[PDB]
């Protein structure tokens, strides 16, 4: 057994009205250092994990696409379009 007598005494008896004012500027500085080392360092890894699957497997993020057929309109020099909904699938392996 470890002789933890002093630590046990400290745990049993501690002040219950002592507090220390904290420098808001220094607290904010440390918190924003943590935010800097979070965003500018860990966001690279997080965005890699989030996006690299989306780059190497794009067909699964766009389920439906559209296709068009056109016919001429001579007497009015217009172009008529007919649309169609298709399931986005691989083509020409």
């Amino acid at each position: 057994m470890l002789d933890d007598t002093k630590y046990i005494q400290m745990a049993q008896k501690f002040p219950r009205n002592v507090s220390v004012q904290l420098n808001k500027k220094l607290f904010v500085t440390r918190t924003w250092f943590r935010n800097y080392y979070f965003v500018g360092v860990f966001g690279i890894f997080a965005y890699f994990i989030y996006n690299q699957p989306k780059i190497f497997a794009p067909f699964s993020g766009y389920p439906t696409t559209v296709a068009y057929k056109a016919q001429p309109d001579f007497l009015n020099d217009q172009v008529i379009f007919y649309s169609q909904q298709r399931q986005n699938t691989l083509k020409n392996f």
Binding site: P58, T65, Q71, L75, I80
Partner: protein, 148 residues
């Protein structure tokens, strides 16, 4: 690549035409094809704002350079990739190919339809498509015309 090879080249007029259905058509085609070099203007603007903040609050030049690089990196990351842009470019290229085929047929048959076009202009005051007008006429006949 196959669709772009079939189309050959893309002009801004067709992109403006497809703006009807895809307002971000240009913003997607620029990310899909190597048309022009894309600078992260928004990221650089945010970096300049952070630089002004750092200058005002007397932050180190290393810190402000890092805060300029970071938004630029975010903008580049959110810009490059985006295969949804490639999908929309494929859709636009299909639309453009169909439009060009129809335009080629129009040009081919312009002389043949010239004579008929004058009487059609002199008889019909509407600019709507012949196909749509004929479909409406067919519906009108199916509804009102007596079967007898």
């Amino acid at each position: 690549l196959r669709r772009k090879q079939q189309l050959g080249k893309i002009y801004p007029e067709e992109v403006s035409s497809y703006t009807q259905i895809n307002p971000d058509i240009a913003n997607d085609l620029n990310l899909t094809f190597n048309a022009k070099l894309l600078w992260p203007v928004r990221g650089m603007t945010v970096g300049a704002g952070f630089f002004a903040f750092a200058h005002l609050f007397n932050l180190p030049y290393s810190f402000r350079l890092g805060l300029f690089v970071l938004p630029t990196a975010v903008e580049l990351a959110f810009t490059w990739g985006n295969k949804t842009s490639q999908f929309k470019s494929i859709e636009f290229m299909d639309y453009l190919l169909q439009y060009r085929v129809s335009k080629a047929l129009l040009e081919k048959n312009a002389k043949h339809f010239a004579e008929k076009k004058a009487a059609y202009q002199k008889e019909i005051n509407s600019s709507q498509s012949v196909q749509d007008l004929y479909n409406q006429l067919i519906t009108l006949v199916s509804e009102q015309a007596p079967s007898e």
